[PDB]
Amino acid sequence: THCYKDLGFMDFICSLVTKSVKVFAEYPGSSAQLRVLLAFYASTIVSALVAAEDVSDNIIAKLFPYIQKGLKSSLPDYRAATYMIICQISVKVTMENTFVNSLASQIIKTLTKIPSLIKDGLSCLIVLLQRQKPESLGKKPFPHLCNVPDLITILHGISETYDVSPLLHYMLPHLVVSIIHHVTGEETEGMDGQIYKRHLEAILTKISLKNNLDHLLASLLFEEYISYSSQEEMDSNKVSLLNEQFLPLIRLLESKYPRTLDVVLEEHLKEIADLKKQELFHQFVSLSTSGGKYQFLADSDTSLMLSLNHPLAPVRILAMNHLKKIMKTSKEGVDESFIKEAVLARLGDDNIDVVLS
Amino acid sequence: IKEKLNLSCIHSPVVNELMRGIRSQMDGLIPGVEPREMAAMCLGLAHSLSRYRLKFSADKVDTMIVQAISLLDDLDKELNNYIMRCREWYGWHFPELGKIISDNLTYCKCLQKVGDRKNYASAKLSELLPEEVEAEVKAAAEISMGTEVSEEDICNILHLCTQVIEISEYRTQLYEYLQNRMMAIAPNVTVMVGELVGARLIAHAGSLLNLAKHAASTVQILGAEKALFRALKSRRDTPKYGLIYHASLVGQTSPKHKGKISRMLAAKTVLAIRYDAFGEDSSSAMGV
Amino acid sequence: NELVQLPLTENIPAISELLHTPAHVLPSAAFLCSMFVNSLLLSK
Amino acid sequence: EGAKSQEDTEAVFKKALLAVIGADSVTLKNKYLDWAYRSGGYKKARAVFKSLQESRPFSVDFFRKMIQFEKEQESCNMANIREYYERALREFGSADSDLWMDYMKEELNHPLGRPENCGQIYWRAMKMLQGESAEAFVAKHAMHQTGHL
Amino acid sequence: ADVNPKAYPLADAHLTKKLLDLVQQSCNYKQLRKGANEATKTLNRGISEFIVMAADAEPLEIILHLPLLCEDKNVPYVFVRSKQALGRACGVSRPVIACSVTIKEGSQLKQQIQSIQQSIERLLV
Amino acid sequence: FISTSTSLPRGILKMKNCQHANAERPTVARISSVQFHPGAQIVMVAGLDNAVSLFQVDGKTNPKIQSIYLERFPIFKACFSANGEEVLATSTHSKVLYVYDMLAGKLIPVHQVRGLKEKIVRSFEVSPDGSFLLINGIAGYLHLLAMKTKELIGSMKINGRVAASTFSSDSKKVYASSGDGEVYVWDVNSRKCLNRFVDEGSLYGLSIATSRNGQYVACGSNCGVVNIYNQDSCLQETNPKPIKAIMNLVTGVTSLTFNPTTEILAIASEKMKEAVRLVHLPSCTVFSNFPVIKNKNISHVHTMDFSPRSGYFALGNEKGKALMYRLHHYSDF
Amino acid sequence: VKSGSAVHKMIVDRQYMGVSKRKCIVWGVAFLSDGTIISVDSAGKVQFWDSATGTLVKSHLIANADVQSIAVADQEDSFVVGTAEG
């Protein structure tokens, strides 16, 4: 009670901890001497934050400098106490966007100093990004996040028991953009774009995506591919490079999550049809294993799959003719099962002309 | 019988009438069996069958709980009387020993080791006593006020104090026996209050089933029956400790909180008493 | 569309027991951090 | 053990426990448990321990040996480890400061241990220990908080 | 289903409604003792008409002393399925595993108590 | 360092007392029903006095739009239709159900429903989608009527008395609570009982409600306990375990109302004065500041309602006062 | 039959979709393999019940007097009822 009611006592405790840590820093192998004190430091402050009916701006203003001092330190126990304090603060109050950005930046930039506390720091970052407002964290700390050793393995180890959705929800919109920049452009780091693509592949293969993260990833890939392909400059060779980069990702996403890209393509059919973007849509669905069943017809803005089964008969002839043309060519967007089911279904309809086709 | 052996069996009302006739002429149909053997065998079979139906086994019987703790008190009174005789009779020969040594078993072992004061100098007492206490015992032997005893007198003292060490040895074995039986009959009760206090509770009620019939408030004040009825008639405050006063949880806590713990412990203990009395599975998970 | 209640410090029993023990008895802060932050996470 | 069958060794041990009843049985029970682990396996030791767990004359080596056997097995059931410690602490908890410290270090160092139990173990140790043993436990735990252990 | 067989006089749904209604009425007239410890005391004092127990106590043995005491005093007893339901009928914010209706001179529930007593003994055949 | 969260905060509810909903038409009779219009800033107030009134919802004045007085028809319950073009009203111990079509300006008394043996019609519910109307009958009978033509579709029978009933959020199921503490789940399209579960510690139920998002089912009982369940738990379990049992109320709960955003649950009891509470739904904790017992204005509560976007909260009592409060967290009507 | 306990109790309305002071007497009961119970009562109606859920499925009002007798053929495709009116 006296800790949060009187802030001078709280400053006394924090200053005592910093002074004692600095005194013992000169002597090697003296971590254990600081055990009990640091535990006391962890035990009181957190409990004080629990006891306060409201946390004021004064408490957070006094606590932030000590938080950064703890993050910059090399003692594992002092960093652990800092992580506990950060977690309790994030749980109890809702903060401004700029200060959450600045706190998450400092958690990310100092992560690799102590290699035995990577998992705790990532879990603390997940808590911070889950209890705060969306879009609080910006894009500046993203490269330092990608450079930590074995990021996806630690994330996979966390994923086996707890929800890791906020961190992936932060990372995925940036990874695709970074891949596109690497393919068409340059990066300051030597091979940063390759590790971006490797990270995205590892996320796809190992960590199961929940809370509609699969839809988010599919929509990001589709929209960003269409946006780049719709630029003023042609860049045909760059478009080919982007195609050969995105093909494994699209195919693996189809393989692990079957129907998500289908739903995304169905939602974007009207928007593609309104503008003159049929050829870009054709190329993108050609990249996938299946999805060439949504090709627009040559003369009108309707999909092949809807054209095959809609009530009007005379244009089903054109749909079946288009399917025959697909059969004669090297099939790359459409798969065998769709064609087989389509022809077996159209053998049995009423109109004899469609039966002949 | 038909499945287990290839044999045909007939049951009929005429068979039942035939059974009735044989029973009526039970004597006169079997010449070998004596009437006395029939009667004695009936009593043995009836009691064993009734014990089997009532789940009476060597483990379930709690009479040995009541017997052991009654004997445990009797041995304590006997041991006290005989030890005073060793200290009084040998105090006329070496009175300084009684004041130096307070452990009664250690006292009698030293007497058995060394007869007279003269033998204390040469003999060694390191195994029985610490070396600094042994030095004090050895030193007091030279400067003594006691009278010299006869050879027959010192032999009589050794025999009595030998009986003391045998009683103390058997009393320890009896206490270990009680710990075995309480953990087997009421394992949950021993976790809650302990072996000694649990056995006193059963001895007071006379049985485990009699103890199970009681409420939690009665168990709390079970030992303190004299203070309870003094307060009830004179309209004063009732007692709050009972036999539970010597339980470990009540003993360790401060005297201010010994009142709250007593009713908290009594309420939880009866739950273990009911479960041990009526449950068919002997385990300490509930008590722990 | 569904509403989810995230864990809170006071509701967790183990965390409260950890916070009610004396400081010198208490183990190192590294164990406390792991247990605390794992308790604050949403279980799946 | 050297020059006779396994069953005869068990027969010798059982006869010895009948003849010796007092404090001299303490050493006999320990050697019986050691033979069971070597002649048999972990299963044989568990059978012998269950039979002897109620014969009250004991020593701390009886429970320390069984704890070591459980640790060597691949399973390492933490429930069994606590179960052995509670039985030993029931017999010698009033005087043994080392046994309480060993139990507390088990909850920290074991991968299956629950370190948050250390608070209640310390509280239980202080009340059960008597006299000088209680103050020895305080010194031993204070040494453990620093790296001196 | 899934009821411990040791709670043999298990009332059905129809009798349960009659029992809990009478228990709720006895609370308004100050004619009910709540709890197993208080229920035991009324049997020793011989001032109880009948005993209601809850069949869902996780160890059932914690209330099995009550049927033995009831058979000595010749007091009828029944079991109900839910201790939560018995607690709300008694007017308590906590679950109750046993309750006892006490003897009152001039009580207005005498006709209702007698009808319930007659209904209970029918379960014993 | 501190900003406002998008979600409704727990503990303290920010409120301001407003002008009474029925200020322009004062009355001394009991208020049976108060409800907000689904698509316009209109509140409808009905009571034991035979009038039905509709007012323009403004925090300052609440001007009168129209008031209609029936001859000998004390309103037991009046509600809007799901689409909101017509008003349905009923009375105590009367067979006729009154339907008022506002767009066509016609007041149709439905005195005769073919195939319905019910002597009086007082308790009824309307589906959220607007295609069905359900009437609570006697001998545990539930009758389903098509909304547009008011013709009987089928009947459902439960064992024991029907205490209360409500529709599912998707309108595909019916929840009916019996007079012995049991709740039945019925399928609307085929009048078959899907499941039968038991409400914990209820001698008999008095009310039941469901949330809009399909997450929550709440049951009120005689002892004053409100149990909140997950909907999936009730469908599959004979003895479901409630998320939280609200113990704050002490007398039988007669009214339950869910917030449109499903962040507030309103509970009330009419047997005691000042017996209304508000519950923060995700947390299942009760706001500590809403019923200001010092003022002593609320008295007995018979009706509660929320505005479509939860900007307003309305309360009807026995004194003929339709109290109204404005919730500052929500900025839309 | 294995454990002689009543799994379900089914309440029969005293009057057809109504209540009356006169008690309703179930004069005959017939049971089908599919799981349906057919009952005839003094109120004059033949009722179908489901054994799994213990709820009424359908009612048929056929007479102004008691319906007193039920009989079902061995092949469960036909049955016959007899009433007080003859």
Swiss-Prot record, chain A:
Cysteine-cysteine disulfides: none
Record organism: Homo sapiens (Human)
Residues where Phosphoserine is found: 337
Gene symbol of the encoding locus: HEATR1
Similarity section: Belongs to the HEATR1/UTP10 family.
Subcellular location: Nucleus, Nucleolus
Subunit relationships: Part of the small subunit (SSU) processome, composed of more than 70 proteins and the RNA chaperone small nucleolar RNA (snoRNA) U3. Interacts with MYC; the interaction is required for localization of MYC to the nucleolus.
Function, in words: Ribosome biogenesis factor; required for recruitment of Myc to nucleoli. Involved in nucleolar processing of pre-18S ribosomal RNA. Required for optimal pre-ribosomal RNA transcription by RNA polymerase I. Part of the small subunit (SSU) processome, first precursor of the small eukaryotic ribosomal subunit.
Protein name per its UniProtKB record: HEAT repeat-containing protein 1
Additional remark text: The protein described in this entry is essential for the tumorigenic capacity of precancerous glioblastoma stem cells and their proliferation during tumorigenesis. The protein is overexpressed in patient derived glioblastoma tissue compared to control brains. Overexpression is more pronounced in high grade glioblastomas compared to low grade samples, and expression levels inversely correlate with patient survivability.
From Swiss-Prot, chain D:
Compartments, record wording: Nucleus, Nucleolus
HAT repeat positions: 40-72, 76-109
Lineage: superkingdom: Eukaryota
Subunit structure of this chain's protein: Part of the small subunit (SSU) processome, composed of more than 70 proteins and the RNA chaperone small nucleolar RNA (snoRNA) U3.
Family: Belongs to the UTP6 family.
Function: Part of the small subunit (SSU) processome, first precursor of the small eukaryotic ribosomal subunit. During the assembly of the SSU processome in the nucleolus, many ribosome biogenesis factors, an RNA chaperone and ribosomal proteins associate with the nascent pre-rRNA and work in concert to generate RNA folding, modifications, rearrangements and cleavage as well as targeted degradation of pre-ribosomal RNA by the RNA exosome. Involved in nucleolar processing of pre-18S ribosomal RNA.
The name this protein goes by in its record: U3 small nucleolar RNA-associated protein 6 homolog
Encoding gene per record: UTP6
Curated annotation (Swiss-Prot), chain F:
Residues in WD repeats: 26-65, 70-110, 116-157, 158-196, 198-239, 248-289
Domain of life: Eukaryota
GO biological process: ribosomal small subunit biogenesis; rRNA processing
Main location: nucleus
GO cellular component terms, semicolon-separated: nuclear membrane; nucleolus; nucleoplasm; nucleus; Pwp2p-containing subcomplex of 90S preribosome; small-subunit processome
Keywords from the UniProt entry: Isopeptide bond, Nucleus, Phosphoprotein, Repeat, rRNA processing, Ubl conjugation, WD repeat
Record location of the Glycyl lysine isopeptide (Lys-Gly) (interchain with G-Cter in SUMO2) cross-link: 294
Function summary: Part of the small subunit (SSU) processome, first precursor of the small eukaryotic ribosomal subunit. During the assembly of the SSU processome in the nucleolus, many ribosome biogenesis factors, an RNA chaperone and ribosomal proteins associate with the nascent pre-rRNA and work in concert to generate RNA folding, modifications, rearrangements and cleavage as well as targeted degradation of pre-ribosomal RNA by the RNA exosome. Involved in nucleolar processing of pre-18S ribosomal RNA.
Protein name listed in UniProt: U3 small nucleolar RNA-associated protein 18 homolog
Source species of the chain: Homo sapiens (Human)
Full-protein positions shown: 224 to 556 of 556
From Swiss-Prot, chain G:
Coiled coil: none
UniProt superkingdom: Eukaryota
Modification after translation, per record: May be phosphorylated during mitosis; may control the association of this protein with WRD43 and UTP15.
Subcellular location, record wording: Nucleus, Nucleolus; Chromosome
Extent of the WD repeats: 10-54, 55-86
Task of the protein: Ribosome biogenesis factor. Involved in nucleolar processing of pre-18S ribosomal RNA. Part of the small subunit (SSU) processome, first precursor of the small eukaryotic ribosomal subunit. During the assembly of the SSU processome in the nucleolus, many ribosome biogenesis factors, an RNA chaperone and ribosomal proteins associate with the nascent pre-rRNA and work in concert to generate RNA folding, modifications, rearrangements and cleavage as well as targeted d Involved in SSU pre-rRNA processing at sites A', A0, 1 and 2b. (Microbial infection) Acts as a positive regulator of HIVEP1 which specifically binds to the DNA sequence 5'-GGGACTTTCC-3' found in enhancer elements of numerous viral promoters such as those of HIV-1, SV40, or CMV.
Record's subunit section: Interacts with HIVEP1 Interacts with NOL11. Part of the small subunit (SSU) processome, composed of more than 70 proteins and the RNA chaperone small nucleolar RNA (snoRNA) U3. May be a component of the proposed t-UTP subcomplex of the ribosomal small subunit (SSU) processome containing at least UTP4, WDR43, HEATR1, UTP15, WDR75.
Source organism of this protein record: Homo sapiens
